Write a protein that binds this ligand. Sequence first.
Ligand SMILES: O=c1ccn([C@@H]2O[C@H](COP(=O)(O)O)[C@@H](OP(=O)(O)O)[C@H]2O)c(=O)[nH]1
Ligand SMILES: [Mg+2]
Ligand SMILES: [Mg+2]
Length: 358
Amino acid sequence: PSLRTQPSLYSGPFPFYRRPSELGCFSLDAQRQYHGDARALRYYSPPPINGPGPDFDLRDGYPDRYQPRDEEVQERLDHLLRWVLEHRNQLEGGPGWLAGATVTWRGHLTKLLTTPYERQEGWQLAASRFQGTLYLSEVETPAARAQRLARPPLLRELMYMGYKFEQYMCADKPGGSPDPSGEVNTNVAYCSVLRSRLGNHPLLFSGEVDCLNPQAPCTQPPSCYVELKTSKEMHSPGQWRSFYRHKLLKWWAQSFLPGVPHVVAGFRNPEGFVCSLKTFPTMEMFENVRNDREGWNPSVCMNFCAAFLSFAQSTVVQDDPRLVHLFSWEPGGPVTVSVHRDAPYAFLPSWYVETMTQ
RNA sequence: UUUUU
Ligand SMILES: O=c1ccn([C@@H]2O[C@H](COP(=O)(O)O)[C@@H](OP(=O)(O)O)[C@H]2O)c(=O)[nH]1
Ligand SMILES: [Mg+2]
Ligand SMILES: [Mg+2]
């Protein structure tokens, strides 16, 4: 019992994907404490129209003004579960809607979408059915853990630079001004909780959002959100082509799901400065590879994801929060399944299970 | 968040 991942198997018509609706949000503060509000939301604030072009020093503050979240702490779905617990009787869709849904992080769905084309990094997804609801929580693979622990100094800095770029592009208040003199604390995060549906699979998922754009004529989330990104400066048509085929696929896969309409990219030079900005509308990303023999196709991404959801739902028959069906995948092969009980794979906490049961 | 496919 396995699931194949080749694009050729999923090249059919684009499947049904419900326009995402924001059900709520939550913020994690500097101490990684949960708050059921939008206190962590920042606002899009690009360089003044009449001022000089951007010249953001992404290395500024590294590492003295860097407070990185502890990656050894595996939160899994915990924060999202707290939101669900605090909103279980306020969910739309009618009675039993949650019972037929699949709950997970936007990032987990993004990895599913890119699976047909990914050739370097594999993954593992733990699944448990509890009160009908199917929960999907990613598991760091042994290899990914090793790669993380062996993270090169350069990669460590590049990760900081991505967060630093946000600091140069966001203000704490609408129409306010960015403040690059502060600390980059990655425990801080604003998450949107959304409702959608792929095929006949209702979805409830949360995703971290970079900022809200006040200037945007459309003020209703998620349409008012913006995704920020950094990438190396490119000069040759060849570099741009590679960017379209590989990087854009991941940018599209991340922003399409939550309904974030724009991705603003900061291109950094070898010295670590962002001296150029470009906006990539999510719904136009595919245009760059539509007639490309080596490009990606959104339909393949979504059809595979729908296929995996069907596969997971049919495989996880037993309603038991202590039972886990681990779905494993490595480039070059199909998605396989193994069954496990309790620690270490079980991920639904007793505080959630006991409350939902009572 | 980021390097690469
Ligand atoms: O990128 C891929 C590549 C392969 N597969 C699968 O790996 C299994 C063994 O084929 P092989 O690659 O020759 O080792 C086959 O499924 P099978 O066991 O025959 O149903 C391929 O379809 C897949 O799902 N994605
Ligand atoms: Mg983000
Ligand atoms: Mg971003």
